[PDB]
DNA sequence: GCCTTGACCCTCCCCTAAGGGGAGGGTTTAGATTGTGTGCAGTCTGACGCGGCG
DNA sequence: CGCCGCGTCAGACTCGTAGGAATCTAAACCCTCCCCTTAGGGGAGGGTCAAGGC
């Protein structure tokens, strides 16, 4: 396309959308709102396996009268306890049921945007619906291994009848030998189908009404999603016009844009058109919040917490005006007196605001000598020290041979020489069954002999450290 | 231990099995307590502990528990060194493309899928779709779409087809394809379309698919899903003094990847619109590309100081990468440097070393020696004794350095005599003292230079420093076999002043008993050094079987030569000292002393010469004054007599008699002549102008002027510089190259003007600027030569060939420039040559031609010998000792195990800084010989020949060719063959602006083959009235007329074409445009009459172009095969030409532009190789048409043409080594059951040792052709990827070696230098050999 | 200037350079050429491993020299291992085969 | 000499009553505002290989 | 097939010195965890000081 720049590639794919007018955003928000309540409608007459609000009003048990908070919850359930008495009559799809449960929907429409409370009721069937799905997958991974059979008669009448296994009698009807080529495995089909039939027991309702109105419940959750998408896609110029005042502060342009878009996606989710204000006035807050939060979390090699960021910024703002006013830079005393903090903290803050230098920094007249060439390894031992360590080990091994073997084993155990660990008196006397005190006696013996001048001046040579 | 190195692509499971855990966030370290944050880039749970045997919290310590893993902080208790070995990884949220396998041309993805790079770079930016599956539809695999066409296909076809976008699409394409089926269907469907343009790409794609199938790789691993992370200690974060930190750039580049991958993992959970997820995937791709190779696919990401960040690929490649900076040369311990100065009292094996330098460099030796004598109890007391500088320390130091050699080195090291081993002598002071005779191999002097000192530590290094590198084994040069220790500046002046003579010297006439009496008389004050006397002298010789026989005589000589004779050793003749000696005579002395006596007498004799030269130069008293520069008294008149001429040649321009150009070009030479007159007057007034009188009266002798004495002896100076001191300076050039008109008529003894000085500064700066900007070209050429030649080593003793090359002298360009003796000395004879009779055998036919054999060849006269060469050696992977010949620095047959490639490269490269960057007469009398000839008698009683390529040679008294020319075609030879003519006689006459082309036989000329309206005019010379039908230019062209190119032909009394004796030939030739023909119609001519006529950078660049095998921009055209020539189908893009064998097929005909004047007419019969035009020849054609020896001979002669023009001497096998290395590849023509392809390029040794085994058990082998590659294209085409990767272009080498799946066997010298092993050459050759034997054992 | 031992750099662990740093002398690329034109293989193997860059050998050599035993035991240099790591970090699988 | 008592002694860590002070982390904020911007860098010459268009 | 455009790769070695590293705005509210405060208590674990039994 004759270009490889991704900022132009973005600003080009972003310009194929039109800006909205004051009525466009209102009637987009209206359908965003009514799809999410069409869903809440569809959740209404699902069986008691849902987490329905019977005692959610009691689970929790603008400051509204307690008598108002206790009473208006009695309207809905006062009609609901008598309404779904008709769950039995004429199957599961009775028309009085649709009429009065969409009258419960007439009641339901009153409400508007809410936290994940509503979410946790539709999840009430998530954990239950896909379950059903996956179980009828199991039957299939138990049929295809043994026999091959055309799927569009079987699964079609599977969708249709759901009364009993009598639809398998529709498999032999065409009189081809693939009818009962299956042998000794159909009880596994009956296994999984029977377990989902006891799932049907706990639900009490057949699958082709639950999935039937889930087909229309999925219409609301998609029709809200699509309107949210085209409410987001029409406002990207706002993000791009805000995020151009945060440049040269540690992030690149497209990073700031992709941080602003995640805030716009929340301003779209929290909007309320009834309050009468435009969309820009509410969205700018979330856009700026996202960009500001990402500048303080990224964009430093060594990360500083947010409270220290605000302290640094405040001290910069004070020193600017004191420099404009005095004509000089103020000493930390003149900053402590006005910032009203203890001077040691003002001295502590002033060290934390420096970014590490690159190891490729050219140092000299040329550019073949770098800063990283003159950096020395500090954790190495000098060879004079290695030789000294080995010579001292040999000298000690020679002096430890003069005195008794049993009387040197105790020194080896007591100072840990040639062993994996140091030991204590009682655990050494464990193997000697000698008293707590005799060990100390023989140690004061050995250490008294070992400094007699017939022996000491070979080891004394080392202690000039 | 290990034996090889492999390279391949890395799967995701391989990258996950190198790692110790996943990096999840950009945290480096805590800002208050600088400890590594968990799961960040410096994490101590993944990468290891930051202190020895400590966890991070502090719970565990003290090396009791060594394998425990702390439960609080997860760090295991171990040593911190492991933070240099452990790696981590990053799991990417969407696959990305590796930039190397996409954008290093040719792209491997576009070559594997057969897609253009534009389509791939459009699918990778979410800018177009691509069809993966066709289903059952009109769309097919790899079809490209746009969004609208994708929507149309969706609403029209639905689910059946499959189209994707981004690197997931490309991974699906690479993953779905089948390689074996595809390559086999490229096999049988190439033979129809095996046209060349398709042939090249089809065979390239075939070998790529076959490489992927055999190597084991999978094509989809070129798309990344897991990323590795380098260990933390190789990209450190380090505190400086002051609390400031410093960091690497890979940290900056890893953080961007991590926190653009995390954001995509967030957006894929918020379920955002796709316009935003696409922007994230693009940003992630760009970030990974900048981490791998920064500036390759766009703009380079820069840091907060506006410099581009360095990447993982910039740390490997280039002049400052790992390879050239840390692996091929290092910094070392036990070494120092200092200023050098001269010590004149030293022996040749000795250097002076300061006491303090030696005390520092030798510290552990002194510690051990101190505590062995019991002088110190422990090493830490020895340290303080040494630090206090007690008196016994200086006595331990003197016996430590006793018999411990020391290596000295001065940069730049142009050849191997730049590092030499000496024995040290402790001195006071701080400068190093160097012997005055080794300053010529070093190129050193004492205007401020500095030298480096190195100490060998082990027993083997000491043995090698004594036996191989000591300065008393290095007296000969390894480029030519000449001595290198010749005396330079004051040895020469002192020896020259002591062996001169003078007239009427004090003490003239006496008769003395020997040299001792002459010395005793000179010291006493009774005689002079220059006095003519008679002395009795005893001298020795050896003709016995190793014994010396003496003889005495009385000789006439001077005192000084009798004094000098006490230095010369026993066995040399007196005639070497009886001259007045100079630099050349002294070099001759040293060389004959080396030839007769040997090495050790030579190294004693050189020292004695140095001492006595210094002593007598001191006693002479030579000085320089202002009166020693004598200006001739008749310069002032030569100057006026040139100025008068330039005035009277200006006034022939002011009156319109001469042009401006000729006026300038005449003033130039009338000033040059006066300059030459002044210079010769000056030099004759100075050279013998001494009138010293004798017993009765005056006479003349050579001068004792100081300047003349130091110029004539060869100590310092020349005539060209005394010319500027005492003559005039001359003519100056502009910076353009133009010469100014008025010259500089002054000299340095008299002083220049402001203007003469100003115009003299131009050339000074031009020279100073050329030097500095030429040194770089010379160094770069040396590096390429070393890289092509580095792995060639003498491997065997005798290969057993009978091939060779024919050595003759070079006699062109004038007199004999190179005798035959200088070109066979040291070589081995290829066949049993015989002195010019018959069966004069001198040979077991393997004969090292040492000096006695060359004398035997020169007492007879033989001028061609067949010798042995390396370009014809039959040994594979090396040369044999007999094809190489003599070791030019040792004087005997080469030893097996020698590194001849590095020596060849260094010898050719070292002198590169001195490179600049109408009728035949006969001199002496001898026979005249002709070759390549075909003759005819003339009408005027002379000889003519109808050969174009003949040769005319002059034969000496005995039959050795002394001069050789070639005559132009059509020329009339003044005299015939077999004549003994004297000098001063012309033998052939040709026109300076014309050459005629003659008839074949006496016949009757007809105007035919041309009409009016043709390329012919009727242009008759109106003043003289002579005109034939004249051939025209293309400006007077009539295109419809050139149907037949005009020529006037010869007929019989039959009216038809004449017989030619021997063959049924057409007697006449058709000539190209603009021919001058004025021969009458109806006026007939004889055989050989004038029918028609023919009207009409050196230095380092040329050497580099010869070794790089460039193609000239006007290459001559040669005959592909032998056959009768004719013009072809005449398709008029430009002219067509064909040749036709008398028996064979002739599909070969090709294009020639009409600007290219042809020299071969339609009746010619040509043989394979001869020219169809003129122009510089191309070496690939010389290798294709003629053999290997022809291109070898051409290259070595054209290279030596440049070196000899400057006075540089290089032997000729040093160029043959390079030519052998440029010929290592072969190309297959017909496989024939040989497991090779039909136009693949293979190594020549592989083909050779395959055919030697196929043909062994009765089978048909392969047929091939040889190739010629330049030095830098043959360095890169070798079969080890480590040498090639460390030479140049590391990216291409590594990507190709990676997808191919190569391995490396570590057989050269550089491979073993990289990994720190013993090289296979020299004292390491035996070791490797033994190892190779175990390769046969297992 | 002269140096027996001293300080080593951080990444590659070779001697530092300069007189102000008490540094070693560069044995450059064209001095290795001279040394392998002589055929001096042991001098070169000790210039590369135990004088410059081998970490265990350069401390074992010191304690052999103090004890009057002029012998070395060379290993593999450190910059080769650095090279292998930086090539593996590009996605390429390079290894030493035995 | 080769062991057993009964006294004494030391350092290190955790604890008391009623909060105080700070470090480091979470969340929202409703008049409207809708396409970058540096007062860029662009700056060498020669050889070679391949694609795109006549 | 041929010419031209355009993109990639290369350009000597060893030493010296030279301080510091360069713009750039959010504010009110909540929570949990960790150490601090007087003047000594309490225990755990590990050492030391005389005295005899044999
Ligand atoms: C410079 C420019 C704007 C703000 Sb503000 C703000 C700050 C304090 C009190 C009220 C408003 C802001 C909002 C969210 C995140 C970061 C900063 C602000 C917001 C919308 C419109 C105008 C100003 C601050 C400094
Ligand atoms: Mg000098
Ligand atoms: Zn721990
Ligand atoms: Zn041979």
């Amino acid at each position: 396309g004759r270009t490889t720049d991704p900022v132009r590639m973005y600003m080009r794919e972003m310009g194929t959308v039109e800006l909205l007018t004051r009525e466009g955003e209102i009637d987009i928000a209206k359908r965003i709102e009514d799809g999410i309540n069409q869903v809440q409608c569809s959740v209404a007459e699902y069986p008691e396996a849902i987490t329905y609000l019977l005692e959610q009003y009691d689970r929790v048990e603008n400051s509204i009268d307690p008598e108002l908070a206790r009473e208006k919850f009695a309207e809905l359930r006062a009609q609901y306890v008598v309404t779904r008495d008709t769950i039995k009559a004429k199957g599961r799809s009775h028309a009085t049921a649709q009429e009065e449960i969409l009258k419960l929907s007439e009641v339901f429409k009153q409400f508007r945007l809410v936290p994940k409370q509503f979410d946790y009721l539709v999840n009430s069937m998530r954990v239950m619906m896909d379950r059903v799905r996956t179980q009828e997958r199991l039957i299939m991974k138990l049929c295809v291994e043994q026999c091959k059979m055309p799927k569009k008669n079987f699964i079609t009448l599977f969708t249709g009848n759901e009364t009993s296994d009598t639809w398998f009698n529709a498999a032999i009807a065409m009189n081809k030998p693939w009818s009962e080529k299956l042998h000794d495995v159909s009880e596994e089909v009956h296994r999984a189908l029977q377990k989902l039939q006891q799932i049907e027991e706990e639900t009490g309702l057949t699958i082709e009404q639950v999935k039937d109105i889930n087909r229309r419940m999925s219409i609301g959750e998609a029709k809200a999603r699509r309107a949210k998408k085209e409410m987001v896609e029409a406002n990207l110029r706002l993000v791009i016009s805000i995020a151009k005042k945060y440049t040269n502060r540690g992030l690149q342009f497209l990073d700031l844009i992709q941080e602003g878009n995640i805030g716009l996606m929340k301003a779209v989710d929290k909007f309320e058109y009834r309050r009468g204000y435009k969309f820009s006035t509410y969205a700018t807050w979330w856009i700026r919040q996202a960009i500001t939060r990402s500048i303080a979390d990224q964009a430093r090699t060594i990360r500083i917490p947010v409270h220290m960021i605000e302290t640094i910024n405040k001290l910069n703002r004070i020193s600017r005006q004191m420099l404009q006013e005095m004509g000089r830079e103020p000493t930390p005393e003149e900053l402590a007196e006005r910032m009203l903090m203890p001077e040691d903290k003002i001295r502590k803050v002033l060290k934390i605001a420096k970014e590490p230098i690159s190891m490729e920094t050219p140092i000299g007249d040329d550019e073949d000598s770098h800063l990283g060439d003159f950096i020395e390894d500090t954790t190495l031992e000098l060879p004079l020290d290695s030789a000294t360590t080995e010579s001292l080990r040999a000298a000690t091994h020679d002096v430890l041979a003069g005195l008794t073997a049993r009387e040197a084993k105790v020194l080896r155990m007591r100072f840990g020489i040639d062993m994996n660990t140091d030991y204590t008196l009682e655990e050494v006397g464990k193997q000697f069954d000698v008293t707590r005190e005799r060990i100390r006696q023989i140690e004061a013996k050995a250490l008294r002999k070992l400094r007699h001048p017939s022996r000491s001046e070979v080891l004394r040579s080392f202690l000039d450290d | 231990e290990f034996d090889a190195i492999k390279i391949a692509l890395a799967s995701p499971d391989m990258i996950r099995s190198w790692s110790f855990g996943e990096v999840k966030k950009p945290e480096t370290i805590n800002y208050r307590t600088f400890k590594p944050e968990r799961d960040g880039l410096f994490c101590a749970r993944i990468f290891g502990p930051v202190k020895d045997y400590e966890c991070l919290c502090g719970k565990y310590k003290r090396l009791k528990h060594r394998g425990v893993i702390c439960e609080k902080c997860g760090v295991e208790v171990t040593q911190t060194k492991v933070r240099r070995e452990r790696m981590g990884h990053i799991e990417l949220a969407s696959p990305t493309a590796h930039i190397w396998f996409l954008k290093s041309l040719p792209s491997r993805i576009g070559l594997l899928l057969d897609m253009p790079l534009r389509d791939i770079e459009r699918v990778l930016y979410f800018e177009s779709y691509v069809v993966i599956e066709g289903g059952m539809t009109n769309l097919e695999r790899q079809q490209i779409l746009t969004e609208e066409q994708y929507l149309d296909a969706l609403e029209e076809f639905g689910d059946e087809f499959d189209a994707k976008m981004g690197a997931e699409a490309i991974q699906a394409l690479l993953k779905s394809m089948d390689l074996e089926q595809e390559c086999e269907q490229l096999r049988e469907e190439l033979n129809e379309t095996n046209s060349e343009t398709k042939r090249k790409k089809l065979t390239k794609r075939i070998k790529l698919l076959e490489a992927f199938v055999q190597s084991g790789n999978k094509p989809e691993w070129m798309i990344l899903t897991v990323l590795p992370v380098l260990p933390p200690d190789l990209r450190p974060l380090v505190p400086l003094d002051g609390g400031r930190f410093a960091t690497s750039d890979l940290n900056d580049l890893y953080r961007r990847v991590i926190n653009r991958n995390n954001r995509l993992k967030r957006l894929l959970d918020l379920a955002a619109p796709d316009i935003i997820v696409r922007n994230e995937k693009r940003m992630l791709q760009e970030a990974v590309d900048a981490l791998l190779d920064n500036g390759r696919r766009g703009r380079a990401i820069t840091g907060s100081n506006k410099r581009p960040l360095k990447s993982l690929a910039d740390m490997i490649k280039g002049k400052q990468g790992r390879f050239r900076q840390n692996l091929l040369g290092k910094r070392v311990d036990y070494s120092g440097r200092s200023v050098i100065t001269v010590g004149p009292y030293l022996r040749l094996h000795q250097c002076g070393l300061p006491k303090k330098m030696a005390l520092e460099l030798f510290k552990p030796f002194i510690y051990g020696k101190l505590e062995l004598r019991g002088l110190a109890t422990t090493i830490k007391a020895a340290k303080k004794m040494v630090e206090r500088e007690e008196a016994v320390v200086w006595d331990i130091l003197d016996e430590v350095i006793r018999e411990h050699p020391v290596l000295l080195n001065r940069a730049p090291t142009l050849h191997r005599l730049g590092i030499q081993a000496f024995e040290p002598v402790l001195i006071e002071g701080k400068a190093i003292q160097l012997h005055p005779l080794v300053c010529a191999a070093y190129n050193a002097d004492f205007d401020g230079d500095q030298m480096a000192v190195h100490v060998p530590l082990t027993l083997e290094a000491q043995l090698e420093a004594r036996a191989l590198m000591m300065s008393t084994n290095n007296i000969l040069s390894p480029a030519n076999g000449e001595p290198i220790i010749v005396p330079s500046q004051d040895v020469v002046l002192g020896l020259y002043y002591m062996t001169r003579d003078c007239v009427n010297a004090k003490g003239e006439g006496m008769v003395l008993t020997g040299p001792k009496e002459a010395e005793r008389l000179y010291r006493s004050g009774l005689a002079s050094l220059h006095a003519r006397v008679k002395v009795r002298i005893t001298e020795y010789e050896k003709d016995a079987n190793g014994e010396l026989v003496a003889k005495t005589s009385l000789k006439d000589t001077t005192v000084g030569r009798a004094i000098l004779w006490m230095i010369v050793p026993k066995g040399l003749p007196y005639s070497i000292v009886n001259q007045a000696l100079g630099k050349k005579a002294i070099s001759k002395m040293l060389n004959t002393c080396y030839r007769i006596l040997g090495l050790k007498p030579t190294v004693i004799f050189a020292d004695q010469i140095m001492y006595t030269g210094f002593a007598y130069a001191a006693r002479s008293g030579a000085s320089v004054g202002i009166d020693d520069m004598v200006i001739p008294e008749k310069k002032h008149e030569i100057i006026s007599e040139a100025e008068a001429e330039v005035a009277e040649i200006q006034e022939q321009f002011q009156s319109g008699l001469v042009t401006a150009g000729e006026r300038y070009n005449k003033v130039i030479d009338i000033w040059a002549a006066a300059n030459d007159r002044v210079s010769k007057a000056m030099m004759d007034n100075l050279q013998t102008e001494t009138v010293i009188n004798r017993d009765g009266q005056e006479e003349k002798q050579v001068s004792f002027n100081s300047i003349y004495m130091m110029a004539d002896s060869g100590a310092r100076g020349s005539a060209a510089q005394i010319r500027q001191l005492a003559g005039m300076r001359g003519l100056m050039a502009k910076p353009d190259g133009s010469i100014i008109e008025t010259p500089i008529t002054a000299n340095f003894r008299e002083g220049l003007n402001v203007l003469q000085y100003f115009i003299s500064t131009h050339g000074a700066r031009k020279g100073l600027a050329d030097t500095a900007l030429k040194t770089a070209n010379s160094g770069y050429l040396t590096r390429r030569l070393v890289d092509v030649a580095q792995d060639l080593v003498v491997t065997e003793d005798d290969c057993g060939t009978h091939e060779g090359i024919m050595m003759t002298p070079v006699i062109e360009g004038g007199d004999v420039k190179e005798p035959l003796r200088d070109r066979v000395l040291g070589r081995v004879t290829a066949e049993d040559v015989l002195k010019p009779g018959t069966a004069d055998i001198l040979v077991p036919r393997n004969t090292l031609l040492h000096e006695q054999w060359c004398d035997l060849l020169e007492e007879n006269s033989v001028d061609a010998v067949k010798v042995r060469s390396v370009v014809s050696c039959d040994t594979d992977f090396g040369v044999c000792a007999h094809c190489y010949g003599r070791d030019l620095a040792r004087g005997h047959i080469i030893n097996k195990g020698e590194a001849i490639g590095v020596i060849a490269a260094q010898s050719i490269g070292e002198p590169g800084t001195q490179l600049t960057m109408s009728s035949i007469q006969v001199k002496n009398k001898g026979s005249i010989k002709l070759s390549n000839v075909k003759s005819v008698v003339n009408s005027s009683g002379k000889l003519v020949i109808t050969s174009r390529n003949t040769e005319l040679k002059l034969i000496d008294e005995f039959g050795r060719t002394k001069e050789s020319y070639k005559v132009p075609y059509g020329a009339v030879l003044a005299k015939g063959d077999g004549e003994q003519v004297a000098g001063g006689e012309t033998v052939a006459n040709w026109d300076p602006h014309t050459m005629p082309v003659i008839t074949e036989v006496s016949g009757f000329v007809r105007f035919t083959d041309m009409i009016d309206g043709q390329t012919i005019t009727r242009q008759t010379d109106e003043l003289t009235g002579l005109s034939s039908l004249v051939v025209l230019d293309s400006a007077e062209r009539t295109a419809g007329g050139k149907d037949l190119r005009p020529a006037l032909k010869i007929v019989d009394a039959q009216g038809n074409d004449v017989l030619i004796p021997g063959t049924d030939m057409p007697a006449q030739y058709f000539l190209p445009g603009k021919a001058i023909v004025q021969l009458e119609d109806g006026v007939q001519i004889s055989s050989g009459d004038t029918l028609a006529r023919i009207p009409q950078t050196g230095g380092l660049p040329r050497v580099a172009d010869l070794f790089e095998a460039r193609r000239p921009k006007e290459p001559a055209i040669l005959a592909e095969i032998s056959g009768i020539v004719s013009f072809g189908k005449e398709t008029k893009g430009k002219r067509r030409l064909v040749i036709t064998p008398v028996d064979g097929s002739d599909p070969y005909e090709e294009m020639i532009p009409k600007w290219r004047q042809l020299n071969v007419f339609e009746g010619e019969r040509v043989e394979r190789g001869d020219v169809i035009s003129d122009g510089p020849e191309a070496p690939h054609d010389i290798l294709r048409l003629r053999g290997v020896h022809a291109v070898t001979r051409y290259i070595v002669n054209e290279v030596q043409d440049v070196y000899r023009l400057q006075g540089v001497k290089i032997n000729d096998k040093h160029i043959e080594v390079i030519v052998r290395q440029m010929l290592r590849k072969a190309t297959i023509v017909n496989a024939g059951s040989s497991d090779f392809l039909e136009g693949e390029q293979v190594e020549y040794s592989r083909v050779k040792i395959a055919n030697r085994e196929l043909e062994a058990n009765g089978k048909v082998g392969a047929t091939y052709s040889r190739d010629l590659l330049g030095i830098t294209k043959a360095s890169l085409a070798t079969e080890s990827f480590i040498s090639a990767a460390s030479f140049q272009e590391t990216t291409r080498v590594l990507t190709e070696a990676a997808v191919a799946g190569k391995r490396d066997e570590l057989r050269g010298l550089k491979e073993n230098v990289i990994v720190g092993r013993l090289i296979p050459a020299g004292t390491g050759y035996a070791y490797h050999q033994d190892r190779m034997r175990r390769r046969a054992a297992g | 200037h002269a140096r027996s031992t001293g300080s080593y750099s951080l990444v590659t662990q070779q001697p530092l350079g300069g007189k102000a740093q008490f540094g070693g002398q560069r044995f450059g690329e064209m001095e290795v050429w001279a040394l392998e034109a002589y055929g001096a293989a042991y001098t070169l193997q000790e210039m590369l491993t135990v004088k410059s860059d081998d970490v265990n050998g350069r401390t074992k050599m010191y304690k052999n020299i103090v004890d009057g035993n002029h012998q070395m035991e060379p290993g593999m240099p450190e910059s080769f291992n650095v090279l292998l790591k930086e090539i593996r970090s590009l996605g390429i699988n390079i290894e030493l085969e035995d």
Side-chain angles (χ1 to χ4, degrees), chain A residues 376-388:
Chain A
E376 160 202 352
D377 196 349
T378 46
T379 81
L380 302 156
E381 186 175 54
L382 305 181
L384 194 76
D385 298 356
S386 299
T388 305

Side-chain angles (χ1 to χ4, degrees), chain B residues 968-972 989-997 1092-1096:
Chain B
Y969 168 65
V972 175
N989 314 131
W990 66 73
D991 311 326
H993 303 325
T994 320
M995 287 306 297
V997 181
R1093 293 182 183 174
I1094 304 298
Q1096 64 175 353

Side-chain angles (χ1 to χ4, degrees), chain A residues 255 258 355 358-359 367, chain B residues 28 244 247 249 263 279 307:
Chain A
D255 273 307
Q258 293 283 124
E355 187 82 20
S358 187
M359 269 179 182
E367 307 210 320
Chain B
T28 55
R244 200 70 192 255
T247 185
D249 297 2
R263 199 150 69 219
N279 192 208
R307 287 178 140 80

Side-chain angles (χ1 to χ4, degrees), chain B residues 1267-1289:
Chain B
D1267 286 328
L1268 189 78
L1269 308 168
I1271 49 176
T1272 176
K1273 299 290 291 296
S1275 302
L1276 287 163
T1278 183
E1279 48 185 15
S1280 89
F1281 66 90
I1282 277 181
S1283 298
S1286 41
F1287 174 47
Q1288 261 189 10
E1289 307 176 6

